């Protein structure tokens, strides 16, 4: 039950590593999961719903990892506080590149995939702006741009730049340099007058 | 000749304002341009080639406007030097939102559209890194990140953030705030130690 479902999810994650969702058939996922095609349609309405579920799991893993950090302050300077938080996203999506890639590609065709990405980006932006404001209240950061606008651009930058690096797009920051690049731009833009 | 071609281009730009390329037919473009369908196939092999041509024109207009700025230094401080340069892209693509949107969407299906966007981003990144390096040689900017990595992230940020704002995506920086938001992040990340 729960286990035929996980088999179909693990198969789809596996196959997405080698080819696009468009090149993967329901029969492929059924055969990989060791079930028939009509049995597959019992657990999922379509191969699109499988990707939605995979994406939902990755996004909620990032989200829960960030909540965990937010509840327990790492004991360290501000540059490292940001680095640790951006790193949740670098490690989480970077450990699931195929789902991240197919999930981003599906934004163009799936309203539920577009709304999932949008809900969670709104959450992460609101958290980012809340930390910047806490920093300006403390007198640790200057009052420059509106915190929510700054947070929005920084989060969009990370979405686009992490994604280019994970894809090895041309152009992209190499994956082994992208964290340091992003933390530099977040710290100078949040703390710089 | 040149004029039946321009008619088909202007029609396609017009129709893209109201609907996606997928909802636009060759007959639509022919009727709008006042020609028959086989005559259309004389000037363009497909509606996809029409979008490629539209995108190529927008991208080269930005590119030529930036070259023009680069050849004639605006007489002003550094914050304003960056603002004027980012503004070429904000005004150029922002005056052609429908083509920008369809052109970005076509990256997923067209190799020639993906290569056009990639060639020009590489050029603009190399120019951005060359100006940062000139600034560090002058002693006006500190030697922090590798200039080409910093340029890459800043350009990716602009591509993603300008585009969200032009689309009115949720989330996005409002279009009337996006320039100021971007110039802040470029100046603090280039000049901040
Ligand atoms: O990376 C960030 C910044 C998060 C903040 C850092 C500390 C507090 C929150 N935000 C973000 C938001 C939406 C999507 C994405 N990506 C989606 C495609 C794969 C790469 C990451 C990242
Ligand atoms: O906006 C920039 C920064 C350019 C630098 C600013 C001064 C020197 C060059 N770069 C850039 C690169 C590729 C695509 C895009 N966009 C593509 C989608 C619509 C919005 C803009 C922008």
Cis peptide leading into residue B171 (ω within 30°): yes
Closest-approach residue (CA) in chain A for B153: A161
Burial of B86 (0-12, 13-18, 19+ CB in 10 A): middle
Residues of chain B with CATH 1.10.357.10: 47-193
Alpha-carbon distance A139 to B180, whole Å? 23
Any atom of ligand 1 within 6 Å of the Cβ of A110? no
For residue A125, what are the CA distances in angstroms to A99, A128, B106?
22, 5, 28
Nearest to B51 by CA among B15, B4, B92: B15
Task: State chain B's maximal CA–CA distance in angstroms.
Answer: 62
Alpha-carbon distance A126 to A72, whole Å? 19
Cis peptide leading into residue A171 (ω within 30°): yes
Burial of A135 (0-12, 13-18, 19+ CB in 10 A): middle
Neighbours of A136 (CB within 10 A): 15
Residues of chain B with CATH 1.10.10.60: 1-46
CB-CB contact of B118 with A164 (8 Å): no
Give B93-142 as a DSSP string: HHTSHHHHHHHHHHTTT-HHHHHHHHHHHHHHHHHHHHHHHHHHHTTSS-
Alpha-carbon distance A109 to A155, whole Å? 23
Closest-approach residue (CA) in chain A for B180: A145
Burial of B45 (0-12, 13-18, 19+ CB in 10 A): exposed
Nearby residues of B98 by Cβ (< 8 Å), 6 or more positions away: B13, B16, B17
Structure tokens at B76: 């002003």
Hey, which CATH number is domain A1-46, 1.10.1060.10, 1.10.40.60, 1.10.10.60, 1.10.260.40? Answer: 1.10.10.60
Give me the residue from B150, B171, B185 closest to A125, CB to CB.
B171
Resolution (A): 1.9
Structure tokens at A16: 């997405």
Closest-approach residue (CA) in chain A for B184: A189
CB-CB contact of A119 with A138 (8 Å): no
Q: What is the CATH number of domain A47-193?
A: 1.10.357.10
8 Å CB contact of B177 and A105 = no
Any atom of ligand 1 within 6 Å of the Cβ of A165? no
- CA angle (B59 as vertex; B58, B60 as ends), nearest 5: 95
Any atom of ligand 1 within 6 Å of the Cβ of A159? yes
Any atom of ligand 2 within 6 Å of the Cβ of B124? yes
Alpha-carbon distance B81 to A82, whole Å? 29
Tell the residue nearest (CA) to atom 15 of ligand 2: B159
Q: 3-state DSSP call for residue A108?
A: coil
First-to-last CA distance in chain B?
57
Nearest to B178 by CA among A145, A176, A58: A145
8 Å CB contact of B181 and A156 = no
């Amino acid at each position: 039950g729960d286990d035929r479902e996980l088999a179909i999810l693990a198969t789809a994650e596996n196959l997405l590593e080698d080819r696009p969702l468009a090149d993967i058939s329901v029969d492929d996922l059924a055969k990989g999961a060791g079930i028939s095609r009509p049995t597959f349609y019992f657990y999922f309405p379509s191969k699109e719903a499988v990707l939605l579920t995979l994406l939902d799991r990755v996004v909620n893993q990032a989200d829960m990892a960030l909540q965990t950090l937010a509840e327990n302050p790492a004991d360290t300077d501000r540059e490292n506080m940001w680095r640790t938080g951006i790193n949740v996203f670098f490690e989480t999506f970077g450990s699931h590149k195929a789902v991240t890639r197919a999930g981003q590609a599906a934004r163009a065709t799936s309203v539920e995939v577009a709304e999932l990405w949008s809900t969670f980006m709104q959450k992460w932006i609101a958290y980012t702006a809340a930390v910047i404001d806490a920093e300006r209240d403390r007198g640790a950061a200057p009052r420059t741009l509106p915190a929510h606008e700054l947070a929005t651009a920084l989060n969009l930058m990370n979405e686009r730049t992490l994604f280019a690096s994970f894809a090895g797009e041309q152009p992209s920051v190499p994956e082994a340099r992208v964290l340091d690049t992003l933390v530099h731009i977040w710290v100078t833009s949040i703390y710089g007058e």
